[PDB]
Design a protein around this ligand. Structure first.
Ligand SMILES: NC(=O)OP(=O)(O)OC[C@H]1O[C@@H](n2cnc3c(N)ncnc32)[C@H](O)[C@@H]1O
Ligand SMILES: NC(=O)OP(=O)(O)OC[C@H]1O[C@@H](n2cnc3c(N)ncnc32)[C@H](O)[C@@H]1O
Ligand SMILES: [Fe+3]
Ligand SMILES: [Fe+3]
Lengths: 675, 679
């Protein structure tokens, strides 16, 4: 029994189903593969097309999943899609009314067209199963918990008819207990409010990181006008008729002004964040307090995109409402895609479930075999120096103890948004200055942002307060208190409120990463590391060896540990040997607007990425000419001869575009099919 | 007391307040000027920036209105804006949360900035008055009716808080009797349905033209699921949580297929339009039957954008409910901008009202003085031949009797969407072939709609069943039956159900145009003309002389009558003497997309108009190089020297871009400041 789970929209690599398809129209595309009830492979399409939270059809992810399972398309017994057919088709039909040139292709036709054109796979109609959206979430969250009965709560922005659903799970059967309508959405509430802070879709966890810097009393009575807690686990959100945003009109009337890009986060902004976070904590705990005592369950599985609110989860853990809580590493819609595989399997026969609680999210493609990795690192030789230590883990522990910030890339990539020891950036957790600098210089992000620690399972209760319910900490699902007597020791990873979104690593969840942290603790006395995701501000978590090396070279990391090779940047790297390539969404434009006296204005030149919310940057006339000659095979140095050789100012301009990922720059060739 | 009324959004000429600001965010921008209670000038900004139903700040409209009144900006005593300040600022604030780079500028500061920078006018805060949206509508509709009191109904998409409002008006006082909430919007219902027909905002009038071709029984029971009529003039529209469109989910579930671009209308499409039109009629007559009985009033004024549904108006007229009905020529948001001026006057002092019922919509800028008009037509000489007949009207009527299709441009442009004898295209109303013929001449694809007839007041009741109430017909507000015995005679202007959107012209409403239609009737025996707006498919109604000549030269009209001059195009017009100028929204682009094997891919050259819904067209590498050299003064022929001369192929390419109005092409210089004609 081999079953594919699918989620996302249906756009091709280089175009969208309608032009500029909004970024929230079926986002976080992914593919998962289950075999005999076990999750054998899963990867988000963002890792492969390099578009964060992409809506494009997860073609590459399907291909990578099949290869990891050693399967052909013809081996797949069924395909589950994470929404009902009538809902996604009605939304497609709506887009087609707004875009009268788009042909009327609905989801079944588009899914089959993508699989046939992109994988040579003719999917028969009877093998495609559409699934209620919150049922898909619930299966994914519950079946990986290792529990044999539980309360299951799903809270997201919306499914087809509901923003929240409550289930009883027993054995492999789900029984719906209750639901909450779409206008009561807590995901929608959090996203509406996120927009007041100059942020957008995907930035909610940044708002969450901002909340502890604020005082929730300032705007508590304002948010109190937007919701009412009612008897027996009910609540209401109070909408308005002015604009499609629950939050902005009231806050505007009280004189709150939305933050602008590039402007500081004021104390009013921080206080706004703190009151928002308190509001959805109050509502969710109200829901759970009622359904815990009503359902009788002592164990909770929590899923849906709202379950990535690590602060909320930590509060649930400390609430005393449950004995055990489980949260999946991919509780957003990528996890619903996996749940749609289990639901499709259930619709066609008995359902097989995982045998054990999931401990590792290392489920994506790996980096390659040892031979091809070493060969590809040799292609990068004009840029990097490579060393092959006898014991890379021992060597990396020492570099960390000496204050180096390390890129760390091993085996299969993490499913879901957290880095957990396979595509990580790691540093000494003790100095508070590491937080200041890794925010400012490495990740190039806001100074208020916290950093998450990883601790060995054996030392976890020496540093963190895990009391209350038994939660699963393998995936940084829970914010927990750092013990007061350890807060000054753990300066880089203790948040302003004394908490940490902790990863507890064990020999079973991540043997190699556990050894790294254990050895570091033997050398320093502190078995705790800072662990942030391996990506710059312009990209999702790195996937391939080329992604890893590109990110290392365009961030300010000290050294890269990749499959036991230590990589350092050459003193003077030769950018000239790199072969530029367009991404499928890369565009180059020479533009004139109107000028004075209704003339044609002066020409300007720009590169941009062609998707909703994609970046753009001005380029010089010289680089515009250079980039127009890109062929995918010719090196940057040779291309540059048509404009008088790779200038130092030209190399610098190209390097800035590379850092922003407007194009692909990498040595000729590629690593080949992954061994 | 000189009061300016404003409506629309706040964008400058060349950018929008947020990029690609949606075409529905405070559209049909306009400026109106009232003086001691009289409307002295009004024009929609679309006529001046040439963007249909534009949302941009009506700066040109304000400048033109002040010039017509002989006023400085500093002479204005108050400015009224057609929405409450908190509502428009909350919408702007919402736009600013979606675009975090936009500076936080709200409506008061933006109004003051545009007026300061555009006119040197420092508007004091106390002179700016913000007005309830449906109140602005009601004042404009009622104060121009000539009525001593009336029931006043406003239906549109939405105001700040309602989609419909009912008032009793008396003297200059308005008293609100009822309202209907935003989600019950009939303007919203109609526009939602319009999208299923492959159309968009501003195409509702086309859907209404299509409805008579359809059988309303096909989808009657489907639409019945979307509304319920209730007691006491109430009704409900049944929404859905699937998508922000009331109509598409249920029709999708029943197998309906939204029409695609360039696809012809199926019978299903025709029937859909017919059931939609029936639906809105049933609901509006349900509202009006209750409020006529409850108010006891025998007179109705009807405004808001829904009041441009002239088939509905015609059915209101034929209902037994009222003795008089009045509809303003600009019942859409441009007229709310007017009504905001009245409300501001009532607020900050006493409200003076118009002396008489409005008979003419000739209220925008004129074409110019007789001498600058002849001076300017001389600049066009390499393209046209001009005659100066003794009596242009007499000549025009003869040409019309011979079968010619004329452009007709006189005086001040019409306020509101209908051409009424000042920016019109006129032809014999009798030949049914003229429908297909004239649609081809202006390159429009609305052969399924008949054109609208204009008739003299004296003959009106010889041709049209005006019975029922007394409606005002000076603005084509009512669809009325064409008398059976006259239907085959009026072949170009009679619809498949026997109806027509009639303009009745009188010596009082438009002296010149009345004389023209009268004279034509003396020569032919039929004192009825076809009258359609003077614009091709790519522009609003022409405004200036240059607009008029440009439109004449880019359509296949036989002859142009403009201010007593007879204009015809030369055989072989010399396009090279035209000076190209970018419009503020013109963009010229060379583009590379991604190619196979991750190469830099297909290279293309394009021109487009940078606004939501703006057109675009491919251009050749040679024309790209020529257009990039446009300086606003050098002629097309001289610019073309830099790429080898103006070849027949290049001139053909440019002409097609001219037809689509991607740039301005006209002789060097301009007509100069419009002459103070002494009126
Ligand atoms: N079907 C569907 O809606 O997709 P989905 O399961 O992937 O969840 C997305 C929703 O989670 C909300 N969300 C994401 N992170 C969140 C956070 N830290 N706190 C609250 N809500 C959050 C987000 O704002 C958005 O409303
Ligand atoms: N504030 C505000 O909403 O603007 P507004 O007063 O200018 O009216 C616009 C509304 O009239 C509706 N509308 C326009 N023409 C229409 C027609 N022939 N039939 C029905 N509705 C129409 C149109 O679909 C739109 O919903
Ligand atoms: Fe979801
Ligand atoms: Fe309106």
């Amino acid at each position: 029994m081999l079953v594919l789970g699918l989620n996302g929209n249906f756009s091709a690599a280089d175009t969208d189903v309608v032009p500029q398809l909004g970024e929230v129209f079926f986002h976080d595309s992914a593919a998962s593969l289950i075999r005999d009830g076990e999750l054998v492979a899963a990867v988000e399409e963002e890792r492969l097309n390099r578009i964060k939270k992409t809506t494009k059809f997860p073609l590459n992810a399907v291909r990578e999943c099949l290869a990891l399972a050693g399967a052909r398309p013809e081996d797949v017994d069924a395909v589950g899609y994470y929404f009902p057919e009538n809902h996604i088709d009605t939304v497609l039909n709506h887009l087609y009314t707004e875009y009268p040139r788009a042909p009327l292709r609905y989801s079944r036709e588009l899914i089959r067209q993508r699989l046939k054109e992109g994988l040579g796979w003719d999917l028969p109609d009877e093998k495609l199963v559409y699934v209620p959206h919150h049922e898909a979430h619930a299966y994914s969250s519950y079946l990986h918990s290792g529990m044999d009965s539980a309360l299951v709560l799903v809270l997201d922005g919306r499914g087809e008819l509901h923003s929240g659903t409550v289930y009883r799970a027993e054995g492999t059967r789900l029984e719906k207990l209750a639901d909450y309508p779409v206008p009561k959405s807590l995901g929608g509430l959090y996203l509406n409010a996120t927009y007041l802070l100059g942020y957008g879709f995907g930035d909610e966890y940044k708002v969450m990181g901002l909340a502890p810097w604020g005082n929730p009393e300032t705007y508590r009575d304002t948010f109190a006008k937007l919701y009412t807690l009612q008897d027996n686990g009910e609540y209401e959100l109070h909408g308005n008729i002015m604009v499609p945003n629950l939050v902005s009109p009231l806050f505007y009337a009280e004189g709150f002004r939305p933050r602008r890009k590039g402007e500081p986060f004021t104390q009013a902004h921080r206080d706004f964040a703190a009151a928002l976070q308190e509001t959805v904590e109050k509502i969710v705990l109200h829901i759970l307090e009622y359904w815990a005592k009503t359902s009788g369950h002592s164990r909770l599985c929590f899923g849906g995109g709202v379950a990535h609110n690590s602060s909320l989860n930590g509060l649930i853990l400390k609430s005393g409402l449950f004995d055990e809580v489980f949260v999946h590493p991919a509780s957003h819609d990528a996890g619903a895609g996996e749940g749609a595989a289990y639901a499709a399997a259930a619709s066609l026969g008995t359902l097989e479930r995982p045998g054990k609680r999931l401990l590792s999210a290392s489920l994506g493609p790996a980096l390659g075999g040892r031979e091809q990795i070493r060969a590809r690192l040799a292609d990068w030789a004009p840029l990097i120096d490579v060393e092959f230590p006898d014991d890379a883990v021992e060597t990396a522990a020492g570099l960390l103890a000496e204050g180096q910030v390390l890129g760390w890339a091993y085996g299969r990539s993490e499913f879901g948004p957290r880095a957990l020891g396979h595509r990580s950036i790691v540093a000494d957790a003790r100095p508070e200055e590491n937080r200041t600098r890794i925010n400012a210089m490495v990740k190039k992000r806001e100074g208020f942002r916290p950093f998450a620690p990883v601790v060995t399972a054996e030392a976890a209760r020496d540093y963190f307060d895990l009391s209350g319910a038994d939660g699963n900490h393998e995936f940084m699902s829970f914010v927990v208190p750092v013990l007061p007597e350890r807060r000054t020791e753990l300066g880089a990873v203790t948040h302003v409120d004394g908490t940490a979104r902790v990863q507890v690593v064990s020999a079973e969840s991540g043997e190699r990463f556990h050894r790294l942290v254990r050895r570091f603790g033997e050398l320093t006395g502190t078995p705790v590391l800072l662990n942030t995701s391996f990506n710059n501000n312009a990209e999702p978590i790195v996937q391939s060896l080329d992604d890893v090396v590109t990110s290392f070279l365009t961030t300010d990391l000290d050294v890269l540990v990749v499959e036991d090779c230590l990589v350092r940047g050459k003193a003077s790297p030769d950018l000239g040997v790199l072969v530029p390539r367009f991404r499928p969404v890369t565009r180059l434009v020479e533009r004139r607007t109107a000028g004075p006296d209704a003339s044609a204005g002066a020409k300007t030149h720009e590169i941009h990425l062609d998707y909703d919310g994609g970046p753009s940057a001005k380029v010089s006339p010289e680089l515009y000419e250079l980039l127009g000659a890109v062929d995918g095979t010719t090196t940057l140095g040779d291309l540059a001869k048509t404009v008088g050789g790779l200038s130092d100012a030209l190399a610098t301009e190209v390097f800035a575009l590379w850092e922003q990922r407007f194009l692909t720059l990498a040595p000729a060739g590629d690593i080949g099919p992954l061994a």
